[PDB]
Structures are given as structure tokens and as C-alpha cells.
């Protein structure tokens, strides 16, 4: 399924998605690219529109 990431750093803000099994698989996906891109923000998953964020 698609899922979404609401990026709402600091210096990156913007929306990305990606096609990922289930939603720990996308979690994994998005962590890692915030993590390469130097975000470090708190979390946030909703279930029924698949969409994660991330706040700095």
C-alpha cells in the first residue's frame, strides 16, 4: 500500500510516499531516510489515512 510522510523539520519540510507492505515496513523506510537527511523529530502514525509525520 502507499504510504505517506509529512516531513515538518526545522531546514526539510515537504511530503514524500512510498509503496511498502505494511506500515512498520514504511516506518523503517521513513526513519531512515529522516535519519539520512538529519531530521530528529517526534513521531506521529495514523492508521486510517497511512500517513506518518515527523516534527522537529
Given at each position: 500500500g502507499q504510504y505517506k510522510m509529512i516531513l515538518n523539520g526545522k531546514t526539510l519540510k515537504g511530503e514524500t510516499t512510498t509503496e511498502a507492505v505494511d506500515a512498520a515496513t514504511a516506518e523503517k523506510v521513513f526513519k531512515?531516510?529522516?535519519?539520512?537527511?538529519?531530521?530528529?523529530?517526534e513521531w506521529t502514525y495514523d492508521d486510517a489515512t497511512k500517513t506518518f509525520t515527523v516534527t522537529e
Open positions: 531512515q531516510y529522516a535519519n539520512d537527511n538529519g531530521v530528529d523529530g
